[PDB]
C-alpha cells in the first residue's frame, strides 16, 4: 500500500538529489521501509517476503524520481547467495530499470548472468519477465540493438544455451519480441 502511494510529481525541476532530503511523506515511507528491511535482515520472517515487497516499493520510488534511478541496491540483491525470491524480484526490478532507463551496461551484465549462474529458475524468470517487460522494443529502436547486441543475442541462441531447452526457447521469445519476422535493420 505504501508502494501504491505512488507520488510521481514532487520533483518539478531537479529534486532528485538529496536536495530536500526529499519531502515530506515520502521520507516517512522511506523510514518505514528502511525499518522493515533492517528488521528482516535481523528477524528474517519467512522468505524475506517483506524484503521482496520492499524492493518493489523502492523501485516504484525510483519510477517517481525520489530516490534516484540507480540499480546498485537491486544489483546488490540480484547477487548469488540470497534467496530465490529476493533475487527474482530484484531481477524483475532491474529489468524494468533497463526498460525505462537506458542502461546498456547492466543489460550486458544481465545477459552475461543469463549465461553464467548455476540456478535454472532465475534464468527462466529473467527471460520470462524480460520478454513480458522488454527494453529495446521492436521498431522503436533508440538504444541501438543493431550494433552488436543482435550479434551476442544470436550467439546466445546458438551458443551457451545447450544446457536446457527452455533457455533458448526464451531466447526465441526474445527474438520474437525484439525484431521478430525480419532482418533487424542491420544490413
Amino acid at each position: 500500500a505504501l508502494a501504491n502511494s505512488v507520488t510521481p510529481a514532487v520533483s518539478v525541476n531537479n529534486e532528485v538529489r538529496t536536495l530536500d532530503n526529499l519531502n515530506p511523506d515520502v521520507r516517512l515511507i522511506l523510514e518505514e521501509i528502511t525499518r522493515f528491511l533492517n528488521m528482516e535482515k535481523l528477524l528474517p520472517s519467512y522468505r524475506h517476503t517483506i524484503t521482496v515487497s520492499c524492493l518493489r516499493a523502492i523501485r516504484v520510488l525510483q519510477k517517481n524520481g525520489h530516490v534516484p534511478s540507480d540499480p546498485a541496491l537491486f544489483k546488490s540483491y540480484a547477487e548469488y547467495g540470497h534467496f530465490v525470491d529476493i533475487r527474482i524480484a530484484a531481477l524483475e526490478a532491474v529489468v524494468d530499470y533497463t526498460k525505462v532507463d537506458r542502461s546498456y551496461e547492466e543489460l550486458q551484465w544481465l545477459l552475461n548472468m543469463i549465461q553464467n549462474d548455476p540456478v535454472p529458475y532465475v534464468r527462466h524468470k529473467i527471460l520470462n519477465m524480460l520478454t513480458k517487460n522488454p527494453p529495446f522494443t521492436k521498431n522503436m529502436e533508440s538504444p541501438l540493438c543493431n550494433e552488436a547486441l543482435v550479434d551476442q543475442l544470436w550467439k546466445l541462441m546458438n551458443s551457451g544455451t545447450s544446457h536446457d531447452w527452455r533457455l533458448r526457447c526464451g531466447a526465441v521469445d526474445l527474438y520474437f519480441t525484439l525484431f521478430g519476422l525480419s532482418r533487424p535493420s542491420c544490413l
Binding site: 538529496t18 523510514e31 528502511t34 525499518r35 533492517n38 528488521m39 534516484p68 541496491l73
Partner: protein, 52 residues
C-alpha cells in the same frame, strides 16, 4: 482529621486504555528505529542517496 487520622496512598492508576497501547506501540517503534540505527552504522552499509 488533618492531625489525628491518616490514610493510604496508592497514587498510580494510569489506566487509559488507548493511551496505554499508544505508549506500548510507540515504544516498540522506538526500539525498531534504535536497532535499525545501530546496525545501520555498524555493518556493511549501502544507501539510497549518496552518503546517507
Amino acid at each position: 482529621x488533618x492531625x489525628x487520622x491518616x490514610x493510604x496512598x496508592x497514587x498510580x492508576x494510569x489506566x487509559x486504555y488507548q493511551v496505554l497501547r499508544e505508549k506500548a506501540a510507540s515504544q516498540r517503534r522506538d526500539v525498531e528505529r534504535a536497532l535499525t540505527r545501530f546496525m545501520a552504522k555498524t555493518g556493511e552499509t549501502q544507501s539510497l542517496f549518496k552518503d546517507d
